[PDB]
Amino acid sequence: AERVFISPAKYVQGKNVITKIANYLEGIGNKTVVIADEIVWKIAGHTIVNELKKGNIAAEEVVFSGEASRNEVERIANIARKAEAAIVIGVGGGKTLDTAKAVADELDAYIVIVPTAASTDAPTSALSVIYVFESYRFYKKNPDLVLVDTKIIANAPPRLLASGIADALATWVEARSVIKSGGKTMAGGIPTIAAEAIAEKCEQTLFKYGKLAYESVKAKVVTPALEAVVEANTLLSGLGFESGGLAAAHAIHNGFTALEGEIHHLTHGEKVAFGTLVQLALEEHSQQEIERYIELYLCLDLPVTLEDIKLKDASREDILKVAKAATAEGETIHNAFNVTADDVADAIFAADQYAKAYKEK
Amino acid sequence: AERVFISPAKYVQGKNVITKIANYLEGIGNKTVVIADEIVWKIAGHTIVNELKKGNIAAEEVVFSGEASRNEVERIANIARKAEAAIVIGVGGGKTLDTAKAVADELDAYIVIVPTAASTDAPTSALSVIYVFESYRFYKKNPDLVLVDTKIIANAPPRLLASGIADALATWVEARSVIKSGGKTMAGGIPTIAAEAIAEKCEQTLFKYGKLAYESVKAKVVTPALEAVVEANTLLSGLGFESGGLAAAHAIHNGFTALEGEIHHLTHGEKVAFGTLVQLALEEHSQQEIERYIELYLCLDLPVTLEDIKLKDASREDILKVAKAATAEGETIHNAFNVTADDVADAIFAADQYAKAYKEK
Amino acid sequence: AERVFISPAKYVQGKNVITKIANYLEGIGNKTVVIADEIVWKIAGHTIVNELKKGNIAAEEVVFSGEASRNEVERIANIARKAEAAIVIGVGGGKTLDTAKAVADELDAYIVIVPTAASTDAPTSALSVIYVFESYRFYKKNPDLVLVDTKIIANAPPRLLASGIADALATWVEARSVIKSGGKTMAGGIPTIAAEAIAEKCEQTLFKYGKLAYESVKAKVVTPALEAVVEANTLLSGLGFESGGLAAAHAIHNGFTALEGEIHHLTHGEKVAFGTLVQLALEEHSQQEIERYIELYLCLDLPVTLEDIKLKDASREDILKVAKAATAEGETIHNAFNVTADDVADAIFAADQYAKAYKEK
Amino acid sequence: AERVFISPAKYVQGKNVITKIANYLEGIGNKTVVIADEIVWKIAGHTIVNELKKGNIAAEEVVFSGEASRNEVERIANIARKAEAAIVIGVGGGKTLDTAKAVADELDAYIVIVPTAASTDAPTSALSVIYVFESYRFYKKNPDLVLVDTKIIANAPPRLLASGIADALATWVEARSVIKSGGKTMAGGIPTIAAEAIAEKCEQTLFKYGKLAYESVKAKVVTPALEAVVEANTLLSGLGFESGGLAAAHAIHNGFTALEGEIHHLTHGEKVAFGTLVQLALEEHSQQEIERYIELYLCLDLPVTLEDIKLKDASREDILKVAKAATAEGETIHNAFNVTADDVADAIFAADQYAKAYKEK
Amino acid sequence: AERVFISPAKYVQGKNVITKIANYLEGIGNKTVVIADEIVWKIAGHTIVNELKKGNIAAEEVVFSGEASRNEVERIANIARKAEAAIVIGVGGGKTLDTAKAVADELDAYIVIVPTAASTDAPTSALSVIYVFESYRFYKKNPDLVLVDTKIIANAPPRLLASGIADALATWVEARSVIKSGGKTMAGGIPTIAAEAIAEKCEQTLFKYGKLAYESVKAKVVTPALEAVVEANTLLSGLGFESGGLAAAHAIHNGFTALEGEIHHLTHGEKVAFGTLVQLALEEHSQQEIERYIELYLCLDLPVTLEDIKLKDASREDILKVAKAATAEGETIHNAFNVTADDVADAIFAADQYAKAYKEK
Ligand SMILES: [Zn+2]
Ligand SMILES: [Zn+2]
Ligand SMILES: [Zn+2]
Ligand SMILES: [Zn+2]
Ligand SMILES: [Zn+2]
Ligand SMILES: [Zn+2]
Ligand SMILES: [Zn+2]
Ligand SMILES: [Zn+2]
Ligand SMILES: [Zn+2]
Ligand SMILES: [Zn+2]
């Protein structure tokens, strides 16, 4: 079969790089539209507009409603049309970035992605989720330019870095399972050797620098350990999951949308952490190998029990709902496993039990 | 400093994938221009046009003159203009592919790169050489789609695969030296961890499957070993040198343009092999480490002495010309070394001597 | 899914154990039918009858026609009926043993299997081949008693021991591929941990004692090395392939029945050797790993090139016939691979080429 | 480039060697000047004069004022002139030893250096610091004779040995960084292989015997462990930093002179310990590698947090002053790093944070 | 006991450093005397004078007679007196360098040592041999400046580099034996840890780069391998033997002066090679360990049998003369061994026999 690898055109990371935005946009154009929510306009939004003005680059300032819906995308796309802007700049978290990508596809515009936290690996990807999760949709392209300012990230909450590490720790576990079973990746074919090298390196980097990166953020300072972890959470994890493959961990994350409740205040990363423990319980690992992950999660104050994810004393019936959704036709778990909803419900309680046993030590 | 990574938008590799060209071009357009020389039109050119016709995709058939000059690029660009084609397809070797990239930049067209041999790592890159070498020039983008058909490659001459392996064996040696010295890559910043993982994996893959891949080609068959080496020669080596960094090996290759003679009938890869031995002689390696490379080159019938590269009994004055050109202001050797032309002339004769000593064993 | 393990009821091996046949049949019965061809009646047949007589055990002496057909089975089954024998004893090579198993199923009789060479792992199994290969058929049970006399085997031709080692060297290669891909075994389910331990031990035993066992046979002596290899060729290889899984190697063996010619004078083992090299060429192994097997085969004077298997200068069309038969619907290659006939034809020429390259060293 | 190695002419170490001073000065002369402060005259000063008298060697007894200034040097140099002494003997700590070296240069006299604690590696060097640090100045030569009496040192305060170990633990960390980056040493060229072997051995010796040496001193006894550590703190650390190279650790030490306060009562060694943690935070080390150093420092009661160095709750503005001074033009940090004052301020808070995290365990 | 380390004040090595001689002599003086024989005046002598003139430095040109005798030293010392030169510069081989050292001691002059081959480790030392060897004599100091130009050395005969490697390969073997037995070094006390680190590193460097350095010289080029070996042959080997200790190898070298004949045309290094094999035969090494040295010697065309050292078919009586001289009272063999002349005669024939046995393989 065919191997396929896709990637954003350019990735740039460093301390204060947001100050060179006008530089990177030189031979591209002079009119842009900038999208961000109220909070982010203060954090980095105004700084970006000011830098663009200094370079004679026009900038239509849009305030993201907060909901990534078709309407909001139609609303913002008209504004850009009117201003006849040829460059779209999305700044902030997940919803804002997906919306910015939808907008760029409508205008066939050059898109710049500027995350304000290294909390998920969605930044570099060509895809998003259509919701209770319903399916994955692809955009026409991966972003043209992803700009990551470590200074901004060293100021974001420590919990958001821990979340990004959790999402990135799922990368090798899931890709490895797709490679072994000969399944397909989101990109369309079997994994390339390039994606395998990137996903495996992603895990080694997190285990080596993860904790030092977490401490750096607590003190709001930029260090080599933080630079390495931010690259892992963004570029390695991004290419690794997209071109390396998804499996059970993210299917479990999706399965949680089948329930209502406080669990939905947790970040994408915190849900993925527990989901990763569930994939490990469905595989053949020794106790020491599983505890190696549990230990790192606790060090980063991430959730490892059903109680931690707001599902204390959940019923078998509740867990079966999650399991049925996670094993739905078309979910990624099928790319690497042959399991039934009942097998998965069983694995959810086993992971909870394994973690409690570790804590009781 | 800032780390930068760039990449072609999509890479697709597999046996007979050329038969799905119309498929990959679906939501892109229906009018294209196809560029190839006389020989390649027979090898794969007509097959591509026929596949495009089957899908109602128009195809202006251009015959590459054979010289990648501004004129040829202006000539072909007009034809595409007239046909109002929105897709450029380059098929064949180096010169044809660079020309196709120049043409796509003029029309701001979507570009598909289809190599007919895995002989150099130029396919995925955003750059070319301006000649006696004068400098490196960047195109506006890395290719949109790189399509690699292993079946076509298993039929190309064994010497061209060996050449591609030689060019790819320079990747880790050069990138490693840039990473250690803190120098910059062609992409603009310091190397990312992603590029380091890819370049190091590139070398491991070649040492493991290189010979089996060479034997596969001799018998004109496609095997897993050939699929791995073709990916290394193209995607790993491509990203590795561009986003990982160049150093002395390719500067020596360029320095050979300072001489006239039969050496210029050798392939880019065969010249890079000797150039790699020269960088190793300028570094601090034990005898066993250098011989590890010499042995693999001989197994692939690649050149390892001045005599093999058509410079038998060359004079110190001749070698100094190569050395002066290789250490020119702006060459890549400066990204990782602090050496003079005289040091480099000395290293050229040492590599020759080390190789003869090995052969005399 | 369910894991399944099956086995013959009892396996007995040792020097001169044929002399205790009357002992093992004590509480079973006193009337038997003994099946063997003309040559084997001399080798061990008469010795068995004589031992049974000494114990007051009746013995109807049947002379196997030489062709394992439904008619021969009906013929022999009547004789046993008439003699009202409750025990069937098959002695000799493959065809005789399969026939004896067919006969025992008709009479619902206790069956004793006594091989006179350790040349294939069919002895302990519950199955046979229905022929140009057409399919695998199961008997109602695995044999009740398998009796292996190392003294008899130390006198059989060295070529037959080498053949048995070849067939046994396919066991781990094939089982490992079924375990990794999650496919099924001949026994019906996924492999047990028991079968995995047995198949892996089978390979370790052959590499450690194979050559010493081969030399023992050349001198017609029984040694610990011979006892270990005879157990590997019979009990380990038998349980390993049946309850561990078949894959590409034996499918290639079957694919050879699609051709006519001198290749059909080779033993089952000699054909399996080449078939094993083909599965390794379809997998991802380094040159050193493949050569480890090639070297051992040459040491045992087993075939490793198309020329050795009587297919010198075979045409692509001839090889495609073998490939099409080997990838037929229902063949075992599908339990561990997703390949086309063309992929397999390519792997057949690669194995030939890899082996020649090794010899040219 | 050129490699350069410099060294004191002779180094002598052992228990009670101060008793053979008259012996070592035999064929040199009979008139000397002895420099020491009030406290040291009691500790070893009078013992040295008495030993010199026994050998008919004249000895002008000078009492060091306590401040190493040009005036004090002019004062003492006249006295030696008047006495027409051809040998200068400095006894005691840092300031006295530097002054003695300045005095010997004025008279072109033979100089003997006799430390009374193994607290810094200044003894063997040809240099001193010109102060708020302003620059490094070289003397005309490295000392002629360095005499180290382990008995005297086993009686000095344990805190001074711990200080010497701290200063010596910076040697390999700094030299290794200069070697990797191709920078220069204080001696003038790139490091020799000799200096690399000495600096690396220095670290291995401290990790093996450091704690046993510390306990020996607490009990005021001379042991092989103490003899090894005293040699590391004096001869290995001395040659290692001078001919091996300085980098960030000592630049941070110098940067502290930009602040006023109680921090200035700490020893040179205690400040270097924290400075070493800062260089490690600017490099790419895993958590375990950094903790290996933190653990040893705590075992020796050395400082590892800003609070320990009297800078509890220091302001970003205060830390920036240290950072600006440490990255001044001409400081040693530039021999191995490309960093800004802001990067260094960030590394100072990271080291503090890493250490607190370790303690909180 | 006391540990003692001595060293030349400054060591400088690099390509063409002879061109900066006037630079290094800046604040020292302007009148010098230059000593060299007829051949060396052409090789480097005139170049040195010319460089000194360019810097307004006077230079009395002396032609070394060729015999290092008291008379020649008195002759040259007068000339320097008359010219009132304050700097002595010795250029060339052994005898010239020792003479220059004797001359500097008479005038109490600053001495610069400039070797034209890296053939022995006498350059940095404070000692010479008084001859049939009679004893070792010390000079008043180790040299002030040792200047090693790798360009000059890359032009000296390959045999002289091999000789220097042989002399340097004796360093660790001899020092290790003194360290283990608790004996003394030439410097006066037991070995320091610094000397042990240097001597051990010396051997590792030779085994890693020795052959590459030998090939570099054959082609007359300067490489990193040559720079490393020249430092080992000069600075590491020099400090290692002087401050690390001599033992049996050099005592055997001295013992050869008891015989007359062609053996005396061999270099100091070639005699030391055989002497090293003899010390190894007197120690407890396995066959593989001894062959590791024999193999390297043969690769460098150094002598390993009595026949190679011009003593073919020597008589027991002849060998006893060498043995008696080598075990003389006061020789260095006693620093590490308790052996009789008869034991040593026996070891000389064993080494010869071991080497022949290796060659006969
Ligand atoms: Zn995720
Ligand atoms: Zn809520
Ligand atoms: Zn290239
Ligand atoms: Zn030509
Ligand atoms: Zn079989
Ligand atoms: Zn036939
Ligand atoms: Zn210090
Ligand atoms: Zn105070
Ligand atoms: Zn010597
Ligand atoms: Zn002679």
PDB file of C-alpha atoms in Angstrom, chain C residues 183-245:
ATOM      1  CA  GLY C 183      -4.514 -13.772  12.555  1.00  0.00           C
ATOM      2  CA  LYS C 184      -5.786 -17.322  13.231  1.00  0.00           C
ATOM      3  CA  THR C 185      -4.012 -20.656  13.438  1.00  0.00           C
ATOM      4  CA  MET C 186      -5.012 -23.939  11.802  1.00  0.00           C
ATOM      5  CA  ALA C 187      -6.463 -25.005  15.153  1.00  0.00           C
ATOM      6  CA  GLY C 188      -9.139 -22.333  14.902  1.00  0.00           C
ATOM      7  CA  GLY C 189      -8.390 -19.385  17.191  1.00  0.00           C
ATOM      8  CA  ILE C 190      -5.613 -16.946  17.960  1.00  0.00           C
ATOM      9  CA  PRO C 191      -2.305 -18.511  19.214  1.00  0.00           C
ATOM     10  CA  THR C 192      -1.934 -19.451  22.908  1.00  0.00           C
ATOM     11  CA  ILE C 193       1.125 -18.370  24.875  1.00  0.00           C
ATOM     12  CA  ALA C 194       2.005 -22.086  24.994  1.00  0.00           C
ATOM     13  CA  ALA C 195       2.277 -22.281  21.189  1.00  0.00           C
ATOM     14  CA  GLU C 196       4.364 -19.103  21.076  1.00  0.00           C
ATOM     15  CA  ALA C 197       6.851 -20.503  23.655  1.00  0.00           C
ATOM     16  CA  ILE C 198       7.128 -23.813  21.756  1.00  0.00           C
ATOM     17  CA  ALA C 199       7.642 -22.219  18.306  1.00  0.00           C
ATOM     18  CA  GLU C 200      10.239 -19.792  19.567  1.00  0.00           C
ATOM     19  CA  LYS C 201      12.097 -22.586  21.407  1.00  0.00           C
ATOM     20  CA  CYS C 202      11.979 -24.626  18.185  1.00  0.00           C
ATOM     21  CA  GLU C 203      14.138 -22.074  16.356  1.00  0.00           C
ATOM     22  CA  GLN C 204      16.618 -21.672  19.231  1.00  0.00           C
ATOM     23  CA  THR C 205      17.096 -25.442  19.360  1.00  0.00           C
ATOM     24  CA  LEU C 206      17.798 -25.751  15.600  1.00  0.00           C
ATOM     25  CA  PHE C 207      20.373 -22.969  15.540  1.00  0.00           C
ATOM     26  CA  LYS C 208      22.157 -24.497  18.544  1.00  0.00           C
ATOM     27  CA  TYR C 209      22.204 -28.183  17.610  1.00  0.00           C
ATOM     28  CA  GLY C 210      21.219 -28.410  13.939  1.00  0.00           C
ATOM     29  CA  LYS C 211      24.722 -28.896  12.467  1.00  0.00           C
ATOM     30  CA  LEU C 212      25.850 -31.303  15.242  1.00  0.00           C
ATOM     31  CA  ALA C 213      22.651 -33.299  14.601  1.00  0.00           C
ATOM     32  CA  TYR C 214      23.415 -33.383  10.861  1.00  0.00           C
ATOM     33  CA  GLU C 215      26.972 -34.683  11.514  1.00  0.00           C
ATOM     34  CA  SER C 216      25.623 -37.313  13.964  1.00  0.00           C
ATOM     35  CA  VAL C 217      23.403 -38.732  11.196  1.00  0.00           C
ATOM     36  CA  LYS C 218      26.243 -38.754   8.671  1.00  0.00           C
ATOM     37  CA  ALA C 219      28.077 -41.087  11.115  1.00  0.00           C
ATOM     38  CA  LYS C 220      24.887 -43.022  11.973  1.00  0.00           C
ATOM     39  CA  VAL C 221      25.137 -42.389  15.723  1.00  0.00           C
ATOM     40  CA  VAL C 222      22.588 -41.189  18.329  1.00  0.00           C
ATOM     41  CA  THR C 223      23.703 -38.171  20.389  1.00  0.00           C
ATOM     42  CA  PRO C 224      22.013 -35.591  22.691  1.00  0.00           C
ATOM     43  CA  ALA C 225      22.248 -33.108  19.808  1.00  0.00           C
ATOM     44  CA  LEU C 226      20.327 -35.536  17.585  1.00  0.00           C
ATOM     45  CA  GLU C 227      17.732 -36.207  20.299  1.00  0.00           C
ATOM     46  CA  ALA C 228      17.122 -32.438  20.659  1.00  0.00           C
ATOM     47  CA  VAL C 229      16.787 -31.854  16.890  1.00  0.00           C
ATOM     48  CA  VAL C 230      14.489 -34.839  16.372  1.00  0.00           C
ATOM     49  CA  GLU C 231      12.207 -33.457  19.112  1.00  0.00           C
ATOM     50  CA  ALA C 232      12.302 -30.017  17.431  1.00  0.00           C
ATOM     51  CA  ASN C 233      11.530 -31.426  13.961  1.00  0.00           C
ATOM     52  CA  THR C 234       8.625 -33.489  15.276  1.00  0.00           C
ATOM     53  CA  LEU C 235       6.962 -32.348  18.499  1.00  0.00           C
ATOM     54  CA  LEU C 236       7.979 -28.598  18.612  1.00  0.00           C
ATOM     55  CA  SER C 237       7.528 -27.978  14.893  1.00  0.00           C
ATOM     56  CA  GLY C 238       4.310 -29.990  14.863  1.00  0.00           C
ATOM     57  CA  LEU C 239       2.525 -28.113  17.679  1.00  0.00           C
ATOM     58  CA  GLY C 240       4.100 -24.832  16.542  1.00  0.00           C
ATOM     59  CA  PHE C 241       2.713 -24.815  13.059  1.00  0.00           C
ATOM     60  CA  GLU C 242      -0.674 -26.331  13.861  1.00  0.00           C
ATOM     61  CA  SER C 243      -1.435 -24.361  17.006  1.00  0.00           C
ATOM     62  CA  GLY C 244       0.932 -21.443  16.259  1.00  0.00           C
ATOM     63  CA  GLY C 245      -0.052 -20.636  12.694  1.00  0.00           C
TER      64      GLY C 245
END
